[PDB]
């Protein structure tokens, strides 16, 4: 029982995944906006001035939903689900955007556009390949993810004069029950009254959506399906009592009609919850593997 | 042929692991000390007043090493390696302790003892089973994990008058190349002069270790191996140029001599780096499964 066990150790292998939280990527007024980063990095290497990991990886940006501020956006909560994506050969960032109590749309899009450009511009120090960028979000984050895909090159949505020498285009979009058409949301049952001036959608645009239709359409992904777009993955539970399942059906049919590469899954018996079971996460993993090509 | 595809969803299944960061567990002066928590929790549930997770899980506390403040402790860095532990049926917390530049030993032990009591006292809020607590640390964090296992019942090491109605005992200790005997560190090669007044060890206790042998011994896990101890896991690389490998051998042989349940792995060809490869993390997982028994219903008899 005085026996010491012995085991070997593989040399020259990246196996430490480091969480780097609270990276400030922009500052509007006195409000700094942050992102959290996950990357293959052994923290001992920086501490002892050793040559770090030289590999570059495709990037996945995660946009946590929050009703654009209906609740305070929690960019840390989903991080444990992002860790296995690093293992597939990605860098992952979870990005904060401003709530509608701070500024109305397109401020939220300005924020995530700027985060994309920040991550591309500073790519080398984060082991990022800036040419391969996917974005993934749930509910209001899925809404913004769609807009990153569908509003590429629209100058009024770029935001501040920061990192303008890189593009804010993304190469793949994964949408978990994201709002699609603000004016059609109240057509189907929900626990929210989405037409109320106090709804998350009305606050997003600064007025009751049915009474402010130009601004409601400006903030709707459905308004941009005629534009060029990267491949899009849509997933939505048929029991979702927050974002009607028909929002995603409407998006999917409009994208197909326009000739877009779109994939949609109906999650039977699922509601307004992240699709964090293994077989549903595999769909997201397969989608980004196809279009971002880790390895 | 591009139709909506259907896939099924399992009900009554926990699959969301939530990271809950920056939980303040104590405050000294105006210095707030925090921990990060990982737990099976779907954040939608609290947001919409749904039934939440009512299971309790054994707790693993991780103590990130930092030379006791030789560098600023980073309690977030290791978080991705702790996530798969939650999937095995634990709650995991990564705990901040003060640097020696703020306070000398036993301040660091006061901090992590108070973290144990805080987590036990607030266990219901975090799905924790307070009767099954393991602790795991690397380098100076492994040093503190050993002291948690070995110094139970010593009032001088409890810290502030906070949550003193619960005990700071732990039930299993995992030690990654933690310093063991501050006075014997310099007996073997290292890129530090651990006897220097500027060494992390000397700053920990407030002076050059060989001149302050009383405080150095009080701060050394080796001084407590005769006391009652939980099961202990020790892992150390034989190329470690920061903490001499023979520190862990010295600890292991002394634990065995006292009749304790000790397990040690020499990691051949590894140095002073976390053992984050799958086959070495599995050893930690097997150790905590054996002694904390996740997935088993647990009562106190």
């Amino acid at each position: 029982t005085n026996h010491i066990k012995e085991i070997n150790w593989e040399q020259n292998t990246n196996s430490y995944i480091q969480l780097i939280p609270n990276i400030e990527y922009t500052k509007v007024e006195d409000t700094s906006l942050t992102l959290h980063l996950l990357v293959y990095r052994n923290p001992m290497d920086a501490l002892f001035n050793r040559k770090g990991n030289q590999e570059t990886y495709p990037l996945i940006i995660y946009l946590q939903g929050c009703g654009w501020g209906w609740t305070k956006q929690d960019t840390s909560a989903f991080i444990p689900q992002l860790v296995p994506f690093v293992e597939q050969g990605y860098v992952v960032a979870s990005v904060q955007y401003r709530g509608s109590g701070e500024a109305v749309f397109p401020a939220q899009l300005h924020d995530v556009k700027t985060a994309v450009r920040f991550l591309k511009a500073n790519a080398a120090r984060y082991n990022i390949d800036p040419d391969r960028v996917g974005v993934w979000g749930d509910s209001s984050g899925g809404h913004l993810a769609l807009l990153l895909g569908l509003t590429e090159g629209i100058e009024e949505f770029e935001g501040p004069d920061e990192y303008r020498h890189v593009s804010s285009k993304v190469d793949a979009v994964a949408d978990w029950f994201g709002p699609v058409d603000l004016l059609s949301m109240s057509k189907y049952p929900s626990i929210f009254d989405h037409d109320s001036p106090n709804s998350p959608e009305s606050k997003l645009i600064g007025g009751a959506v049915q009474e402010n239709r130009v601004q409601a359409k400006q903030a709707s992904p459905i308004s941009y399906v005629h534009r060029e777009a990267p491949p899009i993955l849509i997933m939505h539970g048929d029991q979702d009592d927050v974002v009607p399942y028909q929002q995603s059906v409407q998006l999917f049919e409009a994208l197909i009609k326009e000739g877009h590469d779109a994939l949609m899954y109906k999650i039977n018996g699922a509601g307004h919850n992240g699709f964090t079971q293994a077989h549903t996460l595999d769909i997201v993993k397969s989608f980004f593997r196809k279009h971002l090509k880790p390895g």
Side-chain angles (χ1 to χ4, degrees), chain A:
Chain A
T1 323
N2 193 67
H3 180 260
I4 295 176
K5 317 301 177 195
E6 297 191 29
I7 193 161
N8 66 346
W9 177 256
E10 196 177 354
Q11 303 301 334
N12 308 130
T13 292
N14 300 133
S15 71
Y16 193 122
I17 296 169
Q18 185 177 349
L19 170 61
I20 310 176
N22 312 311
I23 298 166
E24 174 178 313
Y25 75 87
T26 189
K27 203 163 189 175
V28 204
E29 41 135 315
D30 214 304
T31 308
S32 94
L33 294 172
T34 63
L35 59 86
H36 311 303
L37 202 101
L38 298 159
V39 57
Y40 276 111
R41 185 168 302 181
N42 177 7
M44 288 296 192
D45 288 337
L47 284 183
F48 292 97
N49 293 298
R50 306 203 299 248
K51 195 166 77 178
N53 183 8
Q54 303 305 292
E55 286 179 49
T56 59
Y57 308 88
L59 166 68
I60 295 177
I61 294 163
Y62 188 72
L63 305 184
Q64 172 65 45
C66 59
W68 314 276
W70 171 77
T71 189
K72 180 170 156 51
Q73 193 200 10
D74 181 344
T75 57
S76 299
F78 197 62
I79 278 179
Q81 279 66 228
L82 298 172
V83 167
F85 282 77
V86 180
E87 310 188 41
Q88 298 251 325
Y90 300 98
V91 175
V92 182
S94 181
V95 169
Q96 181 187 20
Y97 52 87
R98 278 174 295 171
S100 65
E102 298 168 82
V104 296
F105 187 88
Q108 291 69 25
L109 190 49
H110 288 180
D111 294 349
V112 300
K113 297 246 184 197
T114 302
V116 170
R117 298 195 311 274
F118 172 90
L119 288 167
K120 289 186 187 172
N122 292 279
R125 66 174 177 170
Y126 297 135
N127 300 91
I128 289 173
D129 184 341
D131 297 320
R132 301 139 73 202
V133 178
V135 64
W136 173 20
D138 73 281
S139 49
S140 74
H143 161 268
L144 290 172
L146 293 169
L147 289 167
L148 275 168
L150 296 169
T151 69
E152 167 182 348
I154 292 180
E155 172 62 30
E156 57 174 346
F157 292 160
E158 284 296 332
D161 185 27
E162 293 173 11
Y163 312 108
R164 290 302 198 100
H165 56 277
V166 295
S167 153
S168 47
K169 89 177 162 50
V170 294
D171 303 296
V173 174
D175 158 37
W176 279 4
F177 43 86
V180 163
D181 177 352
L182 264 44
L183 295 174
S184 73
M185 295 232 309
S186 64
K187 269 188 182 59
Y188 300 99
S190 175
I191 55 178
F192 281 89
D193 173 8
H194 292 289
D195 287 346
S196 160
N198 290 111
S199 76
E201 294 74 27
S202 299
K203 293 193 241 190
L204 175 63
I205 64 168
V209 294
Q210 302 300 327
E211 305 174 8
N212 297 280
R213 300 185 85 87
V214 164
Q215 296 306 103
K217 293 167 159 73
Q218 182 188 57
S220 296
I222 199 75
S223 300
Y224 306 98
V225 296
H226 64 287
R227 311 189 72 254
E228 306 225 306
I232 292 178
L233 165 66
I234 306 164
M235 295 170 65
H236 206 131
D238 68 343
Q239 324 268 46
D240 194 322
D241 56 1
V242 179
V243 183
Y245 169 74
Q246 288 293 323
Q247 284 279 297
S248 290
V249 176
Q250 188 190 341
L251 173 64
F252 181 66
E253 292 177 352
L255 288 171
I256 294 314
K257 181 180 179 186
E258 288 291 337
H260 285 307
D261 180 355
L263 194 59
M264 180 176 163
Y265 288 83
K266 169 183 181 189
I267 319 298
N268 287 317
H272 199 72
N273 298 285
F275 307 120
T276 51
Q277 286 168 24
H279 65 306
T280 50
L281 285 168
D282 285 343
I283 297 172
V284 180
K285 287 172 166 95
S286 299
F287 176 74
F288 282 125
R289 180 181 324 126
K290 185 174 203 291
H291 302 294
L292 301 184
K293 315 118 150 72

